[PDB]
């Protein structure tokens, strides 16, 4: 089998993409955050603290001929970015683009946090990292993906965010179309739940590549791209006027400027994120200084190739046994 799913930027700024999800029977189709850094598959529902429901789409369990509670399971999951979210577990269909997965955990939500409220565009995560770090207790839960796999053609995801435009996740074969030249692939450490994988090095904007291993995260969950703070440091230091800003929270820039591209190495290949995937806009209404897309890892504990990066990418999450990244041009 194989499925098939465009996935739309939640704004302007790409901060975030959706991608409708199937639940139950008949189904209930909700707009999840497909997040490659997580392993939970939650979702608003009618069990959500109502005052902590702003708009989103709820998957009601009771209208569902095919969810069942899975008794005495619960979850509880925090984000890298401080917000968190709670509730109970039942299992039910669910599909992605085609792609059915029957008894999957759907994380009913009893409690989000305020981020999460506040978002009225988002109604829920699909965790694609690995099953070990789902928080169902006492019962660990397997990912959409891991139950899809062995169904699949290939065990295989892939990744294609479009930049202020929609993309696609496939599951289950690589459209050779979708990208130019060849896919390089590298090796993924799984020790810590993660598509963890070393990139070989960067360059800012038509500069040398220099060489150096970077270790961090594939993860379509976070939009920006978080560097250890040399490479950052040398990132804006070619953007005159950007700076470092602890009241508002990393590098900010003038938003006259023109940004510099970006490139990453895979291997001995190269991804070139181009400049305009770098701003994020006025810090607020109005504002002239506007936030950068590369920032520092250094307060987080690991690098993260987030949504800046993978969308310059045709990007393949390959579940064989021996997990391991693609990446191609596009």
Same mark, same amino acid.
């Given at each position: 089998?194989?499925?098939?799913?465009?996935?739309?930027?939640?704004?302007?700024?790409?901060?975030?993409?959706?991608? #409708?999800?199937?639940?139950?029977?008949?189904?209930?189709?909700?707009?999840?955050? *497909?997040?490659?850094?997580?392993?939970?598959?939650?979702?608003?529902?009618?069990?959500?603290?109502?005052?902590?429901?702003?708009?989103?789409?709820?998957?009601?369990?009771?209208?569902?001929?095919?969810?069942?509670?899975?008794?005495?399971?619960?979850?509880?999951?925090?984000?890298?970015?401080?917000?968190?979210?709670? !509730?109970?577990?039942?299992?039910?269909?669910?599909?992605?683009? !085609?792609?059915?997965?029957?008894?999957?955990?759907?994380?009913?939500?009893?409690?989000?946090?305020?981020? *999460?409220?506040?978002?009225?565009?988002?109604?829920?995560?699909?965790?694609?990292? *690995?099953?070990? @770090?789902?928080?169902?207790? #006492?019962?660990?839960?397997?990912?959409?993906?891991?139950?899809?796999?062995?169904?699949?053609?290939?065990?295989?995801?892939?990744?294609?965010?479009?930049?202020?435009?929609?993309?696609?996740?496939?599951? /289950? *074969?690589?459209?050779?179309?979708?990208?130019?030249?060849?896919?390089?692939?590298?090796?993924?450490?799984?020790?810590?739940?993660?598509?963890?994988?070393?990139?070989?090095?960067?360059?800012?904007?038509?500069?040398?590549?220099?060489?150096?291993?970077?270790?961090?995260?594939?993860?379509?969950?976070?939009?920006? @791209?978080?560097?250890?703070?040399?490479?950052?440091?040398?990132?804006?230091?070619?953007?005159? /006027?950007?700076?470092?800003?602890?009241?508002?929270? !990393?590098?900010?820039?003038?938003?006259?400027?023109?940004?510099?591209?970006?490139?990453?190495?895979?291997?001995?290949?190269?991804?070139?994120?181009?400049?305009?995937?770098?701003?994020?806009?006025?810090?607020?209404?109005?504002?002239?200084?506007?936030?950068?897309?590369?920032?520092?890892?250094?307060?987080?504990?690991?690098?993260?190739?987030?949504?800046?990066?993978?969308?310059?990418?045709?990007?393949?999450?390959?579940?064989?046994?021996? #997990?391991?990244? !693609?990446?191609?041009?596009?």
């Amino acid at each position: 089998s194989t499925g098939s799913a465009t996935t739309t930027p939640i704004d302007s700024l790409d901060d975030a993409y959706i991608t #409708p999800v199937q639940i139950g029977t008949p189904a209930q189709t909700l707009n999840l955050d *497909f997040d490659t850094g997580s392993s939970d598959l939650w979702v608003f529902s009618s069990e959500t603290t109502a005052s902590e429901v702003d708009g989103q789409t709820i998957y009601t369990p009771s209208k569902s001929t095919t969810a069942k509670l899975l008794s005495g399971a619960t979850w509880s999951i925090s984000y890298g970015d401080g917000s968190s979210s709670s !509730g109970d577990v039942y299992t039910d269909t669910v599909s992605v683009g !085609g792609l059915t997965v029957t008894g999957q955990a759907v994380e009913s939500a009893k409690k989000v946090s305020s981020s *999460f409220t506040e978002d009225s565009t988002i109604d829920g995560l699909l965790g694609l990292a *690995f099953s070990t @770090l789902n928080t169902v207790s #006492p019962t660990q839960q397997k990912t959409f993906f891991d139950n899809a796999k062995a169904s699949l053609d290939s065990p295989v995801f892939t990744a294609d965010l479009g930049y202020h435009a929609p993309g696609t996740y496939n599951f /289950g *074969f690589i459209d050779t179309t979708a990208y130019t030249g060849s896919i390089t692939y590298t090796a993924v450490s799984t020790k810590q739940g993660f598509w963890e994988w070393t990139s070989t090095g960067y360059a800012v904007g038509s500069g040398t590549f220099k060489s150096t291993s970077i270790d961090g995260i594939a993860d379509t969950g976070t939009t920006l @791209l978080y560097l250890p703070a040399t490479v950052v440091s040398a990132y804006w230091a070619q953007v005159s /006027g950007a700076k470092s800003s602890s009241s508002v929270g !990393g590098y900010v820039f003038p938003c006259s400027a023109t940004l510099p591209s970006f490139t990453f190495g895979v291997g001995s290949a190269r991804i070139v994120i181009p400049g305009d995937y770098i701003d994020f806009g006025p810090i607020s209404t109005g504002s002239s200084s506007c936030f950068g897309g590369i920032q520092s890892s250094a307060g987080i504990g690991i690098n993260i190739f987030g949504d800046v990066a993978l969308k310059a990418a045709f990007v393949v999450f390959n579940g064989a046994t021996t #997990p391991t990244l !693609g990446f191609a041009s596009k």
